[PDB]
Design an enzyme around this catalytic site. Structure first.
Site, mmCIF file in Angstrom:
data_model
loop_
_atom_site.group_PDB
_atom_site.id
_atom_site.type_symbol
_atom_site.label_atom_id
_atom_site.label_comp_id
_atom_site.label_asym_id
_atom_site.label_seq_id
_atom_site.Cartn_x
_atom_site.Cartn_y
_atom_site.Cartn_z
ATOM 1 C CD1 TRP A 6 46.607 39.336 46.965
ATOM 2 C CD2 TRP A 6 44.707 40.372 47.537
ATOM 3 N NE1 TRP A 6 45.823 39.425 45.840
ATOM 4 C CE2 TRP A 6 44.651 40.056 46.165
ATOM 5 C CE3 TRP A 6 43.620 41.028 48.124
ATOM 6 C CZ2 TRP A 6 43.551 40.373 45.371
ATOM 7 C CZ3 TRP A 6 42.530 41.341 47.333
ATOM 8 C CH2 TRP A 6 42.503 41.014 45.972
ATOM 9 C CD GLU A 26 38.395 40.866 38.396
ATOM 10 O OE1 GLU A 26 38.074 39.688 38.661
ATOM 11 O OE2 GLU A 26 39.543 41.191 38.037
ATOM 12 C CD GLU A 52 39.952 35.873 38.595
ATOM 13 O OE1 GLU A 52 39.161 36.837 38.604
ATOM 14 O OE2 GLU A 52 41.111 35.943 38.163
ATOM 15 C CG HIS A 104 40.858 39.492 41.571
ATOM 16 N ND1 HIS A 104 41.388 38.988 40.403
ATOM 17 C CD2 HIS A 104 41.678 39.079 42.566
ATOM 18 C CE1 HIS A 104 42.480 38.299 40.680
ATOM 19 N NE2 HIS A 104 42.678 38.338 41.985
ATOM 20 C CD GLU A 139 43.547 35.264 33.795
ATOM 21 O OE1 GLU A 139 42.467 34.722 34.116
ATOM 22 O OE2 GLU A 139 44.094 36.172 34.455
ATOM 23 C CB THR A 153 42.136 40.920 33.367
ATOM 24 O OG1 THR A 153 41.203 40.346 32.443
ATOM 25 C CG2 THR A 153 41.371 41.465 34.561
ATOM 26 C CG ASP A 156 46.108 37.980 42.748
ATOM 27 O OD1 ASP A 156 47.271 37.940 43.202
ATOM 28 O OD2 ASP A 156 45.091 37.953 43.475
ATOM 29 C CD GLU A 157 43.422 39.546 37.212
ATOM 30 O OE1 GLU A 157 43.320 38.310 37.342
ATOM 31 O OE2 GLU A 157 42.452 40.317 37.347
ATOM 32 C CG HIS A 180 45.257 33.951 37.602
ATOM 33 N ND1 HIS A 180 44.255 34.790 38.038
ATOM 34 C CD2 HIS A 180 45.696 33.289 38.698
ATOM 35 C CE1 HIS A 180 44.096 34.643 39.341
ATOM 36 N NE2 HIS A 180 44.958 33.738 39.766
HETATM 37 FE FE LIG Z 1 42.635 36.006 36.362
HETATM 38 FE FE LIG Z 2 40.496 38.794 37.835
#
Ligand SMILES: [Fe+2]
Ligand SMILES: [Fe+2]
Ligand SMILES: [Fe+2]
Ligand SMILES: [Fe+2]
Lengths: 334, 325
Positions: free
Chosen positions: B36, B79, B117, B120, B170, B173, B202-203, B206
């Site tokens: 995205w 971010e 990142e 974000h 991670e 967040t 996404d986090e 990660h």
């Molecule tokens: Fe992250």
């Molecule tokens: Fe992030």
């Protein structure tokens, strides 16, 4: 690595903490006195916000595709900022060891990065509101570029890193300066003011890194001369030279051709930067060199004449301009 | 002062994981063509309904309360300090990116992680700009201050500590953006709810990757990784933006954290939830091959959740034009 820094040169940089505070840090602009992207964008708290955005879109509606490609590519280069602070923190001794080190070398790198964060930001939002460019293809290009990183050949050597940055800071100041003058010709004064304000930031950064190399020439003429020869042999590459948009594997070469066709940091101006740095650093007047440093001095000072001869032949037998599609401008041929 | 630097002989462990890292950690990255982008969640500036889409965005955000705006802005400012975070990952011994474009798998991840990142903070920044509900210049001042200040999580250039810290943060967040999305949905702002939920996902990717790295370290070096886990938990997992200030409030982080935790976004209870999850996820209480030192470290870490459970003002914010929150 072809030119790593000798470990004993750490004593040079460790002895310059007080000098760095007095001479390099003043080149930073205080945050409270610094411009921000909000100053140049439509006011979203105002009742005329939609009218201000509409006025932005009308003044940008006439920008040709070739200028858009040159402008986007410069913004994409700016947006790869996280790679640049990482590059500065690859240099031996002077890197930020803890991420918040109070040493003056690290204080500059973080504050320089903080100033840099606004350059890509203002042009990105301006181009977003304009609606003239494919923002998703641009955002993919930035993601590709950050993932790719950059390879300037600095070999973790602060000598090479400070020479490289001195070169590129002037190159980026010229680039944003020319992008603003071209915007001025097209009646787009606000973007001209934006590009001119960014260019002024690069001039401050140029003066700081140039002053650092000047100090290195004072304390270590041999080492800095050999470093200057090594960087010029490797050539000063644009930090975004690995850029691609998932459609054109040669996006950088095609963007560079469009940018230089418009007169934005041409090969002639690449040589202008070298001649300026030679005169500013007094490369042709440095004494007390050994044979290796003397050969490096004669090599660097002989480069401007050789580059002009290549430019004269290019002025007579220039390559025919090729037009290629750009996903940045919705796949149109530029 | 580094309290827990990595022993130099531990380099052989990470140098033996290049093939393993490519096969097991790199697949956690989302391909760029499948990822995205902020454009997907913002008004389409090439469309004729651009002005209508912007106005509809402002309508959904016109009722967002000040306390939610402060919590959302502070997460975005965190971010936006991304350049500090890639530098942080590249302070770790052995596994750092030596040239800025190294093909080593550790560096390939760091650059690609940084690239993910970058989107974000971008989406929330543009979203909040179009909303007109927050002072963007004061936020941009905060970002400049934060990047200039950097961060010091106490990882001591130790990849053991860095991967443990990042595994912890991670998840923090992911929980933070998850709660920000849940609160946005409660207030009828569905688009931002999807934005915060998409960032949270996404986090989670990660988190799973860094968690998988630490799991491998527990397997190949249970003693070293256990000692590293104890050292990080003693230092506490600090938020990366803990040095934030806006040039107006010297205690901006403490005041922002209080507002964020008051709204239920990563509370002190959830800080302990992360530790309890990582204890079970890494099997900290069942790790084999420990010596006397690792068992003492193991007893400390596994005893922390019980210690944390027993341990468990309105101020102006320049982010919201100086209003008291
Ligand atoms: Fe992250
Ligand atoms: Fe992030
Ligand atoms: Fe710049
Ligand atoms: Fe610059």
């Amino acid at each position: 690595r072809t030119h790593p820094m000798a470990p004993e040169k750490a004593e040079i940089f460790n002895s310059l903490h007080g000098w760095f505070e007095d001479n390099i840090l003043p080149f930073l602009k205080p945050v409270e006195e610094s411009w921000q992207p909000t100053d140049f964008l439509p006011d979203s708290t105002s009742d005329g916000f939609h009218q201000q955005v509409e006025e932005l879109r009308r003044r940008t509606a006439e920008l040709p595709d070739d200028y858009l490609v040159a402008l986007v590519g410069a913004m994409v280069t700016e947006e790869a900022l996280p790679t640049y602070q990482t590059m500065l923190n690859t240099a031996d001794v002077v890197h930020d060891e803890s991420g918040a080190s109070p040493l003056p070398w690290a204080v500059w790198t973080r504050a320089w990065t903080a100033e840099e964060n606004r350059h890509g930001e203002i042009v990105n939002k301006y181009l977003y509101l304009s609606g003239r460019v494919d923002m998703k293809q641009i955002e993919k290009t930035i993601q590709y570029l950050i993932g790719s990183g950059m390879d300037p050949g600095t070999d973790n050597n602060p000598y090479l890193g400070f020479i490289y940055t001195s070169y590129q800071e002037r190159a980026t100041a010229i680039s944003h300066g020319s992008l603003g003058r071209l915007a001025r010709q097209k009646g787009e004064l606000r973007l001209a003011q934006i590009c001119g304000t960014i260019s002024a930031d690069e001039k401050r950064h140029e003066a700081a890194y140039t002053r650092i190399v000047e100090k290195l020439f004072e304390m270590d003429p041999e080492g800095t001369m050999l470093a200057l020869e090594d960087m010029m042999k490797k050539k000063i590459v644009m930090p975004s030279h690995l850029m691609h948009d998932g459609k054109d594997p040669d996006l950088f070469q095609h963007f560079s051709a469009v940018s230089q066709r418009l007169g934005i940091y041409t090969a002639r101006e690449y040589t202008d930067v070298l001649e300026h740095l030679i005169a500013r650093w007094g490369v042709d007047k440095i004494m007390g060199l050994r044979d290796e440093g003397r050969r490096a001095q004669d090599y660097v000072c002989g480069l401007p004449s050789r580059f002009r001869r290549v430019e004269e032949k290019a002025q007579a037998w220039a390559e025919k301009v090729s037009h290629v599609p750009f996903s940045w401008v919705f796949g149109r041929t530029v």
